[PDB]
Write a protein that binds this DNA or RNA. Structure first.
Ligand code: ADP
Ligand code: ALF
Ligand code: MG
Lengths: 98, 93, 109, 439, 74, 73, 80
DNA sequence: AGTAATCCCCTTGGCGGTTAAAACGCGGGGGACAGCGCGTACGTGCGTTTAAGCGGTGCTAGAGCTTGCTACGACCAATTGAGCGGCCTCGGCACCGGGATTCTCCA
DNA sequence: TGGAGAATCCCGGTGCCGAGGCCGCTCAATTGGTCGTAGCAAGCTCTAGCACCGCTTAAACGCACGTACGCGCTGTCCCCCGCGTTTTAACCGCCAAGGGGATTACTCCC
């Protein structure tokens, strides 16, 4: 029989890994292509500096990491340990994005 | 020819922590921090002059700006540092 | 033609009272810039730079590092209540986050 | 002569070395203005090898060339002194940064151990890296085809003027070019203490500062440039366009536009707007018809041909025509990278299966050998006559294997007439302003 | 909604910390009151969503604290 | 000196403000929590409004000083 | 094209770990992709507006930083 | 003074591989969620009393505006040295490996 | 309580690349004098902010009391986690291209 950590144990071990670190968590090349797509939707035959798509990635990831915190507090404010779409929808409505 | 605060940041760093270095990316955030707070103060000083109908950005404008933009204890310590720097610029030339 | 000594040296500052005078003019914040206004501002810019780097040098020392890193700036800025209030809408490149796990998430007995 | 050369100088080149040495030892500058193909790139090496063997100067020597010539220098310098140490300062910025590591400032005269004696670079690099070319001092400078300097308003004149160089030598094909102030820029460059800012007196004051031998007196085995100004004729499509475009002159009062727009359709109407078949494409240009006929006659003759174009888009259209027929070819224009220039010139010179070389007038005209061609066709002509002369003498050159012939595809009745007439005038004027060996 | 006189006295009481014997223009009080009522109304909205999200209908102090925490007021 | 005037925003007033926010039912602990919210807000408005007042060396706080304090929120 | 699907499930997981989240409904992932692109659809259009109004045919790092700063998300490190 | 060629540089695109990250399958566990019972805590209504609101009176602090001038900043030309771009190097930090200590889970 | 084993830490070694200091120079900060004006100063006007009184009645408070709703408990089931397998595309490097921006040449027009 294999040894097995319980459900939720490695979620905590992962939290302690992605907190306490600074690496970018979205893969570089996929984010570039999404940015180029959204750029095409606004102005064709644009170009981007490397530091422009880096600057744009850093702002996005910080926005999503900071958003999840507010949804975790919504989840934890209900009885739940699990975040659900209605927590994002409440968080963004309290923030005033929604 | 670009211009940077890096040499002035180093000469503050080597005062507060003469042993301690700074990485270029950290120095970049120091440039961004100085630029952002310089412009935030000057922006309020502009508005304080504008509100008063005055053509001059005095040290009085920057004092009232500093007491608006900074938290209560950073405000008082900064106002202290600023008021003595001017008081030693005055009584020189 | 006397031997020039910088307006910073006379004010007693590292930060450049000259650039702060020019930049207060180039930005056209107002028509006229007082003589002491660049001095007062250059002193506050120098002071706040020391506040950041004092706490960040401590945090660098805690990490057993000789050299300050964007991580240490974030830790300093968020640990100090007033820097955190001064920068509560600023994202720092490669700052990361504070280690913070909500109490309910830690395992039961 | 310096035994370091591992080569003989020719008779005329040895007197040329003596002149160049005399100017150096007397502390004065001059122009080596020998006719194209007589060997100025060799006399330039001989004086460095003398400064090595006679005085152990061993550099630093700066050698500034047009970009397509830079491999001609790199190779021939290595030939005419096997022991010289050559720095090839060209490439991307990162490559030049790696090359610049060898610019020792600390010795103003280089030891024979120094990592170079001679440095070859582009007329664009000396202006692009000027801040690095300043903060340096040169024992000698060659400007390898100095008619590039002839505009005193050019930055490459303003910059190279002040490089802190103890002596300077210009090589040129014919220095007189458009006029006399455009000569003074070359004279001021070498001797700004003397010249600062009647046509009988010049011959007696340029003589100390110029040497100007000519290929009737030198290399007599290079039989004359047989030439056929063809005076071919428009075709129906071109003349419909030409008349519709010449009508614009009647409406006018814009030749600054139209002379190009006229010469575009003089070359091929598909440059203006494209037609679907080779029968139309060959025959709807009077030039391309007469060219295709002549190329057939030449290929049956076993000739190998250089075609010069003024418009690079015509090198594309000609390259369609060539690929739609049986002809193996090379291309060399100002869009090519320098290694492509090196190899295509070497490829053409390697093997006689290649029929035709397409060359742009300027990028392909200036200064590297094509001595296994035998026929030169100006499909279009340079409106400065001197540049067509350099192009002709890339074939008509020392080592030229066979009797050269030259063709020029003048379209009768077009704006092409004005251009070759005025080139004919200007080459006459240029022989008013010079005739005589110099020294 | 708030009674005018006890808001004036609240304003006076608060202001006395910063400068003794300030004066307040009558319009300046209303500009503070109309901002405070609008701020409290707009916060109770955000708390009511927190209650409704936690399946309560009765708003509770942890709803105010969650509203402010997400608005960044704390 | 004045004191305890934060009890001048009564509990019915907090009801009206909550009902205007759509609240159906109100915990009895809200009423003191609302005062800890209003006080921390109204302090940091008036701090700026007075800082704008005294800069012009005046003594009445004007509606313009309030507007500039709110504009700093 | 749908490079929004290139914001994969593990990446959204990693971001939620840094956000301190223990357990994630599988419905969160498609919600998070919708939220991310609505962010990018505002920052890039302002960053492009800067490049267009300043008459350049490339987008620089500082165009983004002005675009962020103008929407209240000041970024230090990329100029700024 | 114009327009076209030439040449630099820097961004985009493609090709190959290699391996690290994403996707997929599957058991089970424990957390989401509906259901239940109670009890206490909030909404309602009434009688009480408290002071907010209004109309009216009185005073003076000080907001707001004009006059007069000189102290202070704008403007220019000559001087110079503080600050930037380029080049070099060695030491700090990362990355690895291997044994030591810690923590988690089923017994 | 123990134990096994995975996961996290530590200690020393390796090496590489970026931090810290040096060098040349330019151009931006400083010195010196001029000149205009604005805002600091003294002075008048009267607005409106503060204070007090007295009345009215609508708003606030204390209390009774019913029942609507918050909260801990119980049961279930479904669905997201932990771990092995399969596979795909992100990363790296190297070559091409093209494009654009600066410069240079030559002619026509003024
Ligand atoms: N003395 C010589 N011995 C052998 N070859 C020579 C000599 N002089 C010139 N050549 C050849 O003449 C050819 C063209 O000479 P070059 O100097 O390049 O002409 P240009 O005057 O246009 O530079 C070169 O290939 C060179 O090898
Ligand atoms: F001197 Al030449 F082509 F004539 F290089
Ligand atoms: Mg030559």
């Amino acid at each position: 029989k294999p040894h097995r950590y319980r459900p939720g144990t490695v979620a905590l071990r992962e939290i302690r890994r992605y907190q306490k670190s600074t690496e970018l968590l979205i893969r570089k090349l996929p984010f570039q292509r999404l940015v180029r797509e959204i750029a095409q939707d606004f102005k064709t035959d644009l170009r981007f500096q490397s530091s422009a798509v880096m600057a744009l990635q850093e702002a996005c990831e910080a926005y999503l990491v900071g958003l999840f915190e507010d949804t975790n507090l919504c989840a934890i404010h209900a009885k739940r340990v699990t975040i659900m779409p209605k927590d994002i929808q409440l968080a963004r409505r309290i923030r005033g994005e929604r | 020819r670009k211009e940077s605060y890096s040499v002035y940041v180093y000469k503050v760093l080597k005062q507060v922590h003469p042993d301690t270095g700074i990485s270029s990316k950290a120095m970049g955030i120091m440039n961004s921090f100085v630029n952002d707070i310089f412009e935030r103060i000057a922006g309020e000083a502009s508005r304080l002059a504008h509100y008063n109908k005055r053509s001059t950005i005095t040290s009085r404008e920057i004092q009232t700006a500093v007491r608006l933009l900074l938290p209560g204890e950073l405000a008082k310590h900064a106002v202290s540092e600023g008021t003595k720097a001017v008081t030693k610029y005055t009584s020189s030339k | 033609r006397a031997k020039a000594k910088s307006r910073s040296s006379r004010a007693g500052l590292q930060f450049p009272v000259g650039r702060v005078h020019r930049l207060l003019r180039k930005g056209n914040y107002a028509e006229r810039v007082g003589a002491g206004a660049p001095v007062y501002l250059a002193a506050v810019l120098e002071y706040l730079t020391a506040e950041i780097l004092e706490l960040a040098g401590n945090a660098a020392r805690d990490n057993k590092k000789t050299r300050i890193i964007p991580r240490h700036l974030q830790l300093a800025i968020r640990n100090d209540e007033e820097l955190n209030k001064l920068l509560g809408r600023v994202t720092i490149a490669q700052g990361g986050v504070l280690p913070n796990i909500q109490a309910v998430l830690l395992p039961k007995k | 002569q310096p035994k370091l050369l591992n080569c003989q100088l020719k008779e005329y080149q040895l007197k040329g070395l003596n002149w160049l040495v005399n100017l150096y030892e007397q502390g004065i500058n001059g122009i080596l203005a020998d006719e194209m193909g007589l060997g100025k790139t060799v006399q330039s090496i001989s004086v460095m090898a003398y400064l090595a063997e006679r005085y152990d100067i061993w550099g630093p020597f700066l050698v500034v060339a047009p970009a397509s010539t830079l491999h001609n220098w790199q190779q021939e310098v290595s030939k005419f002194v096997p022991d010289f140490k050559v720095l090839p300062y060209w490439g991307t910025a990162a490559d030049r940064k790696v090359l610049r590591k060898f610019w020792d400032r600390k010795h103003t005269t280089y030891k024979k151990d120094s990592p170079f004696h001679v440095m070859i670079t582009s007329y664009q690099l000396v202006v692009s890296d000027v801040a690095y070319f300043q903060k340096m001092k040169w024992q000698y400078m060659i400007l390898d085809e100095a008619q590039a300097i002839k505009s005193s308003q050019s930055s490459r004149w303003k910059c190279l003027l002040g490089f802190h160089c103890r002596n300077r030598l210009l090589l040129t094909g014919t220095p007189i070019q458009n006029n006399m102030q455009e000569l003074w820029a070359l004279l001021h460059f070498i001797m700004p203490s003397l010249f600062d800012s009647q046509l009988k007196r010049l011959h007696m004051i340029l003589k100390p500062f110029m040497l100007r031998r000519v290929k009737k007196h030198v290399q007599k085995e290079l039989g004359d440039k047989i030439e056929i100004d063809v005076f071919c004729e428009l075709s129906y499509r071109q003349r419909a366009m030409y008349q519709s475009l010449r009508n614009q002159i009647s409406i006018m009062d814009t030749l600054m536009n139209l002379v190009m727009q006229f010469r575009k359709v003089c070359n091929h109407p598909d440059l203006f707007e494209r037609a679907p078949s080779m029968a139309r494409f060959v025959t709807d240009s009077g030039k391309l018809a007469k060219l295709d006929e002549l190329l057939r006659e030449l290929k049956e003759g076993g000739h190998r041909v250089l075609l010069y174009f003024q418009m690079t888009r015509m090198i594309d259209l000609m390259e369609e025509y060539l690929t739609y027929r049986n002809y193996k070819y090379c291309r060399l224009d100002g869009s090519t990278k320098l290694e492509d220039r090196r190899d295509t010139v070497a490829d053409f010179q390697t093997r006689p299966e290649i029929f035709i070389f397409l060359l742009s007038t300027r990028a392909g005209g200036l200064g590297i050998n094509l001595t296994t061609a035998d026929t030169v066709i100006f499909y279009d002509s340079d409106w400065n006559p001197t540049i067509d002369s350099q192009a002709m003498d890339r074939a008509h050159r020392l080592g030229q294997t066979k009797q050269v012939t030259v063709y020029r595809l003048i379209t009768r009745g077009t704006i092409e007439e004005r251009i070759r007439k005025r080139a004919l005038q200007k080459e006459e004027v240029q022989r008013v302003v010079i005739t005589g060996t110099g020294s | 909604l708030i009674r005018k006189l006890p808001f004036q006295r609240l304003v006076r009481e608060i202001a006395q910390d910063f400068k003794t014997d300030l004066r307040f223009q009558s319009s300046a009080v209303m500009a503070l009151q109309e901002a405070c009522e609008a701020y409290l109304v707009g916060l109770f909205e955000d708390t009511n969503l927190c209650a409704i999200h936690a399946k309560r209908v009765t708003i509770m102090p942890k709803d105010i604290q969650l509203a402010r925490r997400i608005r960044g007021e704390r | 000196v004045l004191r305890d005037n934060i009890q001048g925003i009564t509990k019915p007033a907090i009801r009206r403000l909550a009902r205007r926010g759509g609240v159906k039912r109100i915990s009895g602990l809200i009423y003191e929590e609302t005062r800890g919210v209003l006080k921390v807000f109204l302090e940091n408005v008036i701090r700026d409004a007075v800082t704008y007042t005294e800069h012009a060396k005046r003594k009445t706080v004007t509606a313009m000083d309030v507007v500039y304090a709110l504009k700093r929120q």
